[PDB]
From a paper:
We first measured the enzymatic activity of 12 mutants and found that eight of them (D137A, K141A, H176A, F179A, E236A, R240A, Y242A, and Y242F) almost completely abolished their activities, H279A mutant retained approximately 65% of the activity compared with WT, while mutations of Asn243, Arg272, and Tyr322 to Ala only negligibly affect their activities. Residue His176 is located close to Tyr242, and the H176A mutation shows a slight influence on the Tyr242 side chain conformation. Therefore, mutation of Phe179 and His176 possibly results in the dysfunction of Tyr242 and hence loss of the catalytic activity of FdlA-NTD. Based on our structural and docking models, several positively charged residues such as Arg240, His176, and Lys141, located near the +1 subsite, potentially serve as neutralizers in FdlA-NTD, weakening the negative charge of the C-5 carboxyl group at +1 subsite, and making the C-5 proton susceptible to the attack by a Brønsted base. Next, the positively charged residues including Arg240 and His176, which are located near the +1 subsite, neutralize the C-5 carboxyl group of D-GlcUA at +1 subsite, thus reducing the pKa of the C-5 proton, making it more susceptible to the attack by a base.
FdlA from Flavobacterium sp. SA-0082 is an endo-type fucoidan-degrading enzyme that cleaves the sulfated fuco-glucuronomannan (SFGM) through a lytic mechanism. We show that the FdlA-NTD adopts a right-handed parallel β-helix fold, and possesses a substrate binding site composed of a long groove and a unique alkaline pocket. Our structural, biochemical, and enzymological analyses strongly suggest that FdlA-NTD utilizes catalytic residues different from other β-helix polysaccharide lyases, potentially representing a novel polysaccharide lyase family.
Author numbering: 1 to 443
The structure:
């Protein structure tokens, strides 16, 4: 019942067909610059466009090496390795690696999941090739950049009820690793997602070298010179939902925000954020995740974070995104450090908005002297200094339950009100707010 093919060339015709079961034979397949052209293997991007429905593709023991030169072979167009347009497809076990570090002519996405009821499982993806690489978003992630970018992102989940399951996604590229645009009921489950980090001090040491950042005197898009003392990811978000986007389902082009995302049992390491879903609508649910060495742990805006952990070595484990946040229910374990602390944000959590129920647990006994749980106040966050991103800082918190089962101190700013705090110790709580309740608990 399964058709086995032995070349990429033989594989491609099956992509336009419905109801097929195909296996690409174990082996290594290389895609080079010479494979792109009019009479070549790939005359268009996306390279692999899955247009059929109700099909299964088995990539067990297949290694697909794509030279990043391919990212420049299509003119000034976005290049995608895989795009799924059809429905009810299952793609499994592929090991895909970007070879070299050549940047795109415009931008690239490794995998794009449109349509409905699709699943990608057991993939091992390595993402490379982007510009600039080494600054994170300090010099621009969208329009009006200080340094123009050529981004290369990992898995873009769109469509309806699309499912990423048990994949490993390693990025050494400036771009989001797993992200959602116009996705309805996307699920990310059991994935390992990993970027890498660089200190702003190391970036600032490019002074006098003639680097791209040296040429702009390290002036960031946030309106100030890049500050020392922070650890940045070279990637964008680990798992991030966007509030805009376009998707294609059953012949229909759809422009909408992401809605109803679910993230289960994922591990995210060294990205700009662990799980950020505040811009998604509907029900947000995050369970069983581990976030290590990210610039921010969990920010879902509203919904449930349960049985999740994050360490605090490079940024807070928890951040309310806006003063409009409402109904954020979270139980987060502050994990032992995965490396030495280098947290310039001076906070393990920043809490605001209203009607939250927050529990923090930890076994940590050595508390860095700069780290505290903040309810309201002036977060010293890399991107929210000096009035930058003003809606994401300096906002009030009201009617919040805060169960602090940790040794971390708590600072309730004067803009806090009706905060019900329970804590292992009350001696390290500073309360400058209005009508707050503070009670001790035994352990």
């Amino acid at each position: 019942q399964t058709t086995t093919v032995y070349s990429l060339e033989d594989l491609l015709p099956y992509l336009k067909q419905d109801n097929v079961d195909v296996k690409l034979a174990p082996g290594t397949y290389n895609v080079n610059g010479f494979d792109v052209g009019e009479d070549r293997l790939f005359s268009t991007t996306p390279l692999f466009l899955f247009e059929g429905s109700n099909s299964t593709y088995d990539f067990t023991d297949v290694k697909l090496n794509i030279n990043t030169v391919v990212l420049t072979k299509f003119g000034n167009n976005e290049v995608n390795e895989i795009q799924i347009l059809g429905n009810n497809n299952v793609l499994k076990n592929l090991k895909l690696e970007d070879i070299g570090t050549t940047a795109p002519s415009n931008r690239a996405q490794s995998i794009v999941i449109d349509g409905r009821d699709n699943r990608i499982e057991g993939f091992h993806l390595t993402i490379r090739g982007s510009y600039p690489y080494g600054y994170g978003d300090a010099f621009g992630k969208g329009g009006g950049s200080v340094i123009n970018h050529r981004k290369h992102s990992g898995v873009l989940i769109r469509g309806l009820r699309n499912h990423l399951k048990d994949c490993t996604i390693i990025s050494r590229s400036y771009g989001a690793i797993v992200f959602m645009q116009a996705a309805s009921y996307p699920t990310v489950e059991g994935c390992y997602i990993e970027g890498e980090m660089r200190s702003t001090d190391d970036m600032l040491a490019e002074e006098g070298t003639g680097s791209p950042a040296d040429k702009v005197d390290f002036m960031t898009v946030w309106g100030y010179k890049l500050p020392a003392g922070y650890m940045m990811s070279l990637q964008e978000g680990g798992i991030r939902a966007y509030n805009a986007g376009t998707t294609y389902i059953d012949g229909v082009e759809i422009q909408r925000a992401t809605d109803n995302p679910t993230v289960l049992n994922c591990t995210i390491k060294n990205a700009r954020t662990g799980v950020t879903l505040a811009h998604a609508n509907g029900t947000k649910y995050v369970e069983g995740c581990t976030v290590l060495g990210c610039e921010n742990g969990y920010s879902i805006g509203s919904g449930t974070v349960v049985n999740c952990g994050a360490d605090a070595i490079y940024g807070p484990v928890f951040k309310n995104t806006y003063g409009s946040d409402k109904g954020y229910n979270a139980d987060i374990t502050i994990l032992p450090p995965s490396d030495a602390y280098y947290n310039g944000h001076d906070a393990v959590a920043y809490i605001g908005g209203s009607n939250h129920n927050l529990t923090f647990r930890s076994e940590i006994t050595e508390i860095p002297s700069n780290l505290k749980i903040m309810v309201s106040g002036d977060l010293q966050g890399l991107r929210v200094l000096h009035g930058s991103n003003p809606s994401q800082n300096n906002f009030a918190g009201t009617n919040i339950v805060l169960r602090n089962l940790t040794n971390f101190p708590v600072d309730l700013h004067s803009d806090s009100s009706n905060i019900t705090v329970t804590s292992c110790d009350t001696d390290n709580i500073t309360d400058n707010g209005t009508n707050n309740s503070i009670e001790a608990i035994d352990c």
